[PDB]
Write a protein that binds this ligand. Structure first.
Ligand SMILES: [Ca+2]
Length: 664
């Protein structure tokens, strides 16, 4: 009935498990934020300090030419200054949490100076504003993911299920996910978030949890300016620019710095940039007046009820993202979230291109409230999903159509085959257990082979080239599954690179086009079989060149390699239909390839009492030099051997490998 008793921390301590996951126990909120700062510094200190330095607008100053473009970009958009403003604009309670987090970082570095790379030492001390600045850069001035939520009625046990499944870069520093656990007398949060963020974006606890995917919210407008007589033409008149003289320091090879002038020009729209070709472009970013994004996430993930959650969401301080919610009470929700300008005309394509910058006709000033955006709560189908598809099949049966919303909010483009799989996997299954839920997450179907091979194979068999004939039989015998042992998968990928373009998203070659009326079974067929066979001819050559043969085992070429761990790969490209994603790189000279992005933080939660959750982090929980917690999870990933996620104090106590008492 009621959830299990909340644990009441009586001292400040971090209990680390064997995988380098910190369980931070604090006697109050600032204590927990401090411990969290300390832990992030231990696990990712170098890259966090680097990023904070950048978000200060001091990249060029600290590290020279390689960081200058970012410095100019951030200074022109007034990011470091706005962060100082946002910091002061925090509620006093949340500002104290931000101060504590920054102090935790500083105290870690103070106590462990040997753990801090020489190049980033100059960044210290960090402040609450630094924290705010980085979050500002990340959200407003910087892939893929899956998301599932399942309602009780669709499960065997009667408890909601949740999937957290972002697919960002395995290398990009600011996209590094970190797993942590925060406990105070008043709240509990478990999950993953980008390094440097003091709040957990992919969070769950005993009561509730959320996950995120990219929706590509069009939160900015690029205005083409008409330059005339030193100014710009606007409503038939020439307006002079706002001009501000700024400057920044650039580190030289000899370790000195040089002062570089930077004039920031602004039109009524926003700051002005000149492009390569010579187009003067004013950039107008929505939601610059929304200082509460971090606290919004915090209030969302510590909500005592769905009503409280929705009230926090409705603040409109989080500028983008599809956000999916589930709780132990049994509510599931999908929200197409972001800060979207109210506009009187124009579809999404119009607002994504260069918009005329000569007229107040196109100057928006207001943004949509939450109730104007596509949302689904407890739908008849008993699930919600999003795999970066436009928000038109978030559940099945659908509860709204594209007509119900302004045409500028979201595209109406063909749903990817991964997204089609996502809908099929949830809709086609009933009486789900957590085990089965987890099994479905591993899906790696070559859906595009289902759509194309029935037409391609017979066409290829009539080609006079015996090697093309053999290729057809190889593809024909394939079970259309991206398994390690597959001898046809690599060849099929190579054919698809031609048939459907290098991103596998091309549509022109299908016989039957995509249709929202058949959203999980179109597009289908091969429009021009003869042409497709010539593509296979080329693909055969490409496969042999890249991999050495047309039938090399998929998991022999596709490897997951971190430090000295080298394990076989399975699953693949989302746009080919693989739900579980590994975006394999181009191969090296031996035909070996590894994931550029794909599965990173993967968690599956059942809101039973107590909750039960399993997860993995592909690239471990630390990237600091010398850590044992970088390559220590990837072998488990290769076997889909998920860790039980430990939220209960006694579970944490049984798993502890390191104890860090702390003071605040
Ligand atoms: Ca150390």
């Amino acid at each position: 009935q009621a959830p299990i008793a909340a644990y009441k921390p009586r001292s400040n301590e971090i209990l680390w498990d064997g995988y380098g996951v910190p369980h931070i126990y604090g006697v109050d909120a600032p204590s927990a934020f401090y411990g969290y700062g300390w832990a992030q510094a231990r696990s990712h200190g170098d890259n966090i300090l680097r990023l904070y330095g950048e978000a200060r607008g001091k990249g060029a100053e600290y590290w020279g030419p390689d960081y200058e473009q970012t410095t100019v970009w951030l200074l022109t958009n007034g990011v470091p200054e706005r962060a100082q403003q946002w910091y002061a604009q925090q509620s006093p309670d949340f500002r104290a949490n931000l101060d504590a987090f920054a102090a935790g970082i500083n105290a870690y570095a103070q106590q462990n100076p040997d753990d801090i790379s020489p190049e980033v030492r100059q960044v210290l001390p960090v402040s609450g504003a630094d924290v705010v600045a980085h979050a500002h850069r990340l959200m407003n001035f910087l892939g893929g993911a899956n998301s599932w939520a399942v309602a009780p009625g669709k499960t065997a046990n009667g408890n909601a299920l949740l999937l957290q499944n972002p697919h960002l870069s395995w290398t990009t520093d600011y996209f590094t996910y970190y797993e942590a656990h925060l406990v105070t007398p008043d709240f509990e949060i478990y999950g993953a978030t980008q390094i440097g963020l003091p709040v957990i974006r992919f969070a769950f606890n005993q009561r509730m949890g959320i996950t995120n995917t990219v929706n590509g919210m069009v939160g900015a407008t690029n205005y083409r300016l008409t330059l005339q007589d030193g100014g710009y033409l606007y409503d038939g008149q020439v307006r002079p620019f706002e001009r501000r003289q700024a400057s920044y320091r650039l580190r030289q090879a000899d370790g000195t710095t040089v002062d570089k002038p930077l004039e920031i020009r602004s039109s009524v729209h926003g700051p002005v940039f000149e492009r390569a070709d010579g187009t003067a472009v004013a950039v107008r970013v929505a939601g610059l007046d929304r200082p509460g994004m971090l606290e919004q996430y915090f209030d969302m993930i510590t909500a005592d009820s769905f009503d409280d959650y929705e009230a926090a969401l409705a603040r409109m301080q989080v500028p983008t993202f599809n956000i999916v919610y589930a709780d132990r009470e049994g509510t599931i929700n999908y929200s197409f979230n972001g800060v979207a300008p109210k506009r009187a005309e124009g579809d999404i394509a119009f607002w994504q291109g260069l918009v005329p910058g000569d007229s107040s006709r196109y100057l928006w000033t207001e943004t949509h409230p939450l109730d104007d955006l596509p949302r689904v709560t407890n739908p008849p189908g008993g699930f919600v999903q999003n795999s970066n598809d436009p928000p038109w099949t978030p559940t099945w049966p659908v509860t709204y159509t594209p007509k119900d919303f302004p045409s500028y909010l979201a595209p109406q483009t063909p749903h990817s085959l991964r997204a089609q799989q996502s809908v099929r996997l949830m809709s086609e299954n009933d009486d789900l257990t957590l085990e089965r839920f987890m099994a479905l997450q591993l899906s790696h179907r070559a859906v595009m082979a289902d759509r194309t091979l029935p037409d391609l194979i017979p066409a290829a068999l009539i080609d006079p080239d015996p090697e093309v004939q053999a290729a057809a039989r190889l593809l024909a015998a394939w079970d259309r599954e991206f398994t390690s042992d597959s001898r046809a998968a690599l060849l099929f990928e190579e054919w698809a690179r031609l048939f459907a373009g290098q991103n596998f998203a091309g549509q022109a070659g299908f016989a039957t086009p995509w249709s929202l009326d058949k959203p999980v079974s179109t597009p289908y067929g091969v429009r021009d079989p003869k042409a497709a066979v010539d593509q296979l001819r080329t693909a055969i050559a490409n496969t042999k060149r890249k991999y050495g043969a047309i039938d090399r085992p998929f998991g022999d070429a596709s490897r997951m390699i971190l430090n000295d761990v080298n394990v076989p790969g399975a699953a693949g490209y989302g746009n080919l239909g693989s739900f579980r994603v590994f975006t394999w790189s181009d191969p090296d000279e031996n035909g070996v390839r590894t994931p550029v992005h794909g599965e990173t933080w993967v968690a599956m939660i059942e809101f039973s009492t107590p909750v039960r959750a399993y997860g993995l982090m592909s690239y471990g929980n630390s990237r600091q030099p010398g850590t044992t917690h970088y390559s220590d999870q990837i072998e488990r990933v290769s076997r889909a051997d998920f860790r039980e996620l430990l939220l209960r104090r006694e579970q944490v106590e049984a798993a502890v490998q390191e104890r860090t008492p702390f003071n605040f």
